[PDB]
């Protein structure tokens, strides 16, 4: 039980999905053909890794995943790639025409033609679960499918599965690798439509990942492959508690209790360390204290913002590898006495700690050094609202002139949806301001 279904939407979601599931197979010892010699229960089982992998009678371990894109060329690489034998053909769903970077086409014109088939395939996976826990939805903000079709899917999933939990991994746009001028529009539209249907969303700022690859890994011009392999490690750290077990393991849902004080305030900031190349990691062992200190270096954040200028509502530390509580507690004590960690006055200040003893894995030919211990911090900070402000500002600049709006109206949308979505974002920025104010 406690199965988790992953849904990868659009190019960004699909390609990140490829990197994640490759990394999962290596962490669990699953071969590209789905075989897992260490698994002695054939056809099924209740092991921790079965939350993400189902099992066939022939010994194949199949991701509990659906890949969906409105054009086929990205998923076609999966169909012909190294892990093509990993997925059943029906898990990889493609249309013929994409959303042309237009939320309206992903949510309406083009998306409505495939939504029923997607829900049918998700249902096929859910029926195989004896205790479905929820969904993980990987998508970009800027793409027409990642924004428009995701919102449609999320709305439909709330209908078909009630309040069953839905988590997002959302790719926040960056000019260095962006492909459409209207990505601010699509970002605001999908954030507004999905807000009430998402329980927890981890935003990944492509510019933050871009800078990290340049600064920490000395990659001159990072590609999506560079970015996605780093993103995989963070996603892996977050889901490791669901896929492995241990005495000191803490379930992701338990962190969730602390990370979400109000339904709309459900955007944790993730920070990951250590990101180091093999050259620098050689003969340099990074202790628990050093990787923990790195979690409070804003340059290692997954979203560009300054927590030193906001207030904390929760701090979670997800360690993996050779880590014991003694060294964790000592490291935390040092950090509080030397960092600006200001909590809101209505939250406790303790850090919530989890430790998965399975050490991190790296994909062959990657840029990340293989380390004995890693950590991902998940904090709820008012500073993440900076990401909304930057995006909302670009929205206002274009919408004041109605620039490009005709592409959305032409597909059936109304200006009222734009203003409605923008007002919801203004209220969200306002909500993050109010929760930071001291109590009277």
């Amino acid at each position: 039980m406690r199965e988790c279904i992953s849904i990868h939407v659009g190019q960004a979601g699909v390609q990140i999905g490829n990197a994640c599931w490759e990394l999962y197979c290596l962490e669990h010892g699953i071969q590209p053909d789905g075989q897992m010699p260490s698994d002695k229960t054939i056809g099924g089982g209740d092991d921790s890794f079965n939350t993400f992998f189902s099992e066939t009678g022939a010994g194949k371990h199949v991701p509990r995943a659906v890949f969906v894109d409105l054009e086929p060329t990205v998923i076609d690489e999966v169909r012909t790639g190294t892990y093509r034998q990993l997925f059943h053909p029906e898990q990889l769903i493609t249309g013929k025409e994409d959303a042309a970077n237009n939320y309206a086409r992903g949510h309406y014109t083009i998306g409505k033609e495939i939504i029923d088939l997607v829900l049918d395939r998700i249902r096929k996976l859910a029926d195989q679960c004896t205790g479905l826990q929820g969904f993980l939805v990987f998508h970009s903000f800027g793409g027409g499918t990642g924004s428009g079709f995701t919102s449609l899917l999320m709305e439909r999933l709330s209908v078909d599965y009630g309040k069953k939990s839905k988590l997002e991994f959302s790719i926040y746009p960056a000019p260095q690798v962006s492909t459409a001028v209207v990505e601010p529009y699509n970002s605001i539209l999908t954030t507004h439509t999905t807000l009430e249907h998402s329980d927890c969303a981890f935003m990944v700022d492509n510019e933050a990942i871009y800078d990290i690859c340049r600064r920490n890994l000395d990659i001159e011009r990072p590609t999506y492959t560079n970015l996605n392999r780093l993103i995989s490690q963070i996603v892996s750290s977050i889901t490791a508690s669901l896929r492995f077990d241990g005495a000191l393991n803490v379930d992701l849902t338990e962190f969730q209790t602390n990370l979400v004080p109000y339904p709309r305030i459900h955007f944790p900031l993730a920070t990951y360390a250590p990101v180091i190349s093999a050259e620098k990691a050689y003969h340099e062992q990074l202790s628990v204290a050093e990787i923990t200190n790195a979690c409070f270096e804003p340059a290692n954040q997954m979203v560009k913002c300054d927590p030193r200028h906001g207030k904390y509502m929760a701090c979670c530390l997800l360690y993996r590898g050779d880590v014991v509580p003694k060294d964790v507690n000592a490291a935390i004590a040092t950090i509080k006495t030397k960092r600006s960690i200001q909590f809101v006055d209505w939250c406790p200040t303790g850090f919530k700690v989890g430790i998965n003893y399975q050490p991190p894995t790296v994909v062959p030919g990657g840029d990340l050094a293989k380390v004995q211990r890693a950590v991902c911090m998940l904090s709820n900070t008012t500073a993440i609202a900076e990401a909304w402000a930057r995006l909302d500002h670009k929205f206002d600049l274009m919408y004041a002139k109605r620039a490009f709006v005709h592409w959305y109206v032409g597909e059936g949308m109304e200006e009222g949806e734009f203003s409605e979505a923008r007002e919801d974002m203004a209220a969200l920025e306002k909500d993050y301001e109010e929760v930071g104010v001291d109590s009277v």
């Binding site: 039980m1 209790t257 602390n258 004080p261 003694k326 006055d345 939250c347 919530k352 109590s439």
Partner: protein, 423 residues
């Protein structure tokens, strides 16, 4: 005569398992349920906690409850896991997500009836059931929410029986989630109404003891449970071995509870262990009353003792025991209320606990316990004035009014203690 034990949730099942490990050793019961002791004192009152199965095998009268199987699976494969009656494992699969509402109103309601079926089957086999014994935490969801739900259902079906709990109180120093003050406040209101005796086991005190006294740099839940196991064995000695004082749950309540709502006890233990020098009766008496030996993080000098029960275990001089118990009373008589004469009762048991030749267990009904409820009340209010983390509860059908009423009744409990601290 017979007591029916219930353990609910992760904490409740982990401390309950250890409890059965310890008293099984004291009564000479091996993991198979076979007796291998050298004294008849071990078997004279064994039926209080054990049913005698076929072949002269002893089975704990224990019911294991949880909304997820994880913790109970470990118990079944634990050291004494094979002794428990397989039918008495009652578990769901969804869990309670550290949510009192899930344990009390939704997830737990779906499972409670099957738990009561097991309780009924045990009670019906009792020649003269005297009451129930629940182990649980108040900071989680199952032990706190479904545990208090079970108490309410049990009281409805056995309203003339005694209800006793070992309730682990949450602490930010040993915390799993931020909503523990919510779950604890909601639970205390239930306990105030539907229990006769509650041993307040404060994880703040257990941590401080392990860290300061036992010099354990980083205490684990196992280290905390060591102290809990020793305390639970001590406070149940009078129930498990021949004796004149507090030999059953009702007589204990009559001696300890002068007012129905003020039934929250402060336990203590001496010597504190994690050593070959046996103590002296004077040393047991001083440590037993020392605040550093209390399992509820409250200073006894900040209040007054309404009643006290002291239990000495081991071969020692009863004459010297009475002299020392009268010594501490006559020297600090200001901390014992003068309107309850002779409110300190002492029992002695020849059989000491494992690993020690002498020990002492403290059970105090002190008005200083209000500091514990004050602490929970402040942590509760700090979040509730901003309605923080409440969506986890309203999503299960609860309204904010229920939180306001739980807060009010615990503040009332605090003021009622302060009433008698100045009498």
């Amino acid at each position: 005569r017979e007591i029916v034990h219930i353990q609910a949730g992760q904490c409740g099942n982990q401390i309950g398992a250890k409890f059965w490990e310890v008293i099984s050793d004291e009564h000479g019961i091996d993991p198979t349920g076979s007796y291998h002791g050298d004294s008849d004192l071990q078997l004279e009152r064994i039926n209080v906690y054990y049913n005698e199965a076929t072949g002269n095998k002893y089975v704990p009268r224990a019911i294991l409850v949880d909304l997820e199987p994880g913790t109970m699976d470990s118990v079944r494969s634990g050291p004494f896991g094979q002794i428990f009656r397989p039918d008495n494992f009652v578990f769901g699969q969804s869990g309670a997500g550290n949510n009192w509402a899930k344990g009390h109103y939704t997830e737990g309601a779906e499972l409670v009836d099957s738990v009561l079926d097991v309780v009924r089957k045990e009670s019906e086999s009792c020649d003269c059931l005297q009451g129930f014994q629940l182990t649980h935490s108040l900071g989680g969801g199952t032990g706190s929410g479904m545990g208090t739900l079970l108490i309410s259902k049990i009281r409805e079906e056995y309203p003339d029986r005694i209800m006793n709990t070992f309730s682990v109180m949450p602490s930010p120093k040993v915390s799993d989630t931020v909503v523990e003050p919510y779950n604890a406040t909601l639970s205390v209101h239930q306990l105030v109404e539907n229990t006769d005796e509650t041993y307040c086991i404060d994880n703040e005190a257990l941590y401080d003891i392990c860290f300061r006294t036992l010099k354990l740099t980083t205490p684990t839940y196992g280290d905390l449970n060591h102290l809990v196991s020793a305390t639970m064995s001590g406070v149940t000695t009078c129930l498990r071995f021949p004796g004149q004082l507090n030999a059953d749950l009702r007589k204990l309540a009559v001696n300890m509870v002068p007012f129905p709502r003020l039934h929250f006890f402060m336990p203590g233990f001496a010597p504190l262990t994690s050593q070959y020098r046996a103590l002296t009766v004077p040393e047991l008496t001083q440590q037993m009353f020392d605040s550093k030996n209390m399992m509820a993080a409250c200073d006894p000098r900040h209040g007054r003792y309404l009643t006290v029960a002291a239990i000495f275990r081991g071969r020692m001089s009863m004459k010297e025991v009475d002299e020392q118990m009268l010594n501490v009373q006559n020297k600090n008589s200001s901390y014992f209320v003068e309107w309850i004469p002779n409110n300190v009762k002492t029992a002695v048991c020849d059989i000491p606990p494992r690993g020690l030749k002498m020990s002492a267990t403290f059970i105090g009904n002190s008005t200083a316990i209000q500091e514990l409820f004050k602490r929970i009340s402040e942590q509760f209010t700090a979040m509730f004035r901003r309605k923080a983390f409440l969506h986890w509860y309203t999503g299960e059908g609860m309204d904010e009014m229920e939180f306001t009423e739980a807060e009010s009744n615990m503040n009332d409990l605090v003021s009622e203690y302060q009433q008698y601290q100045d009498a």
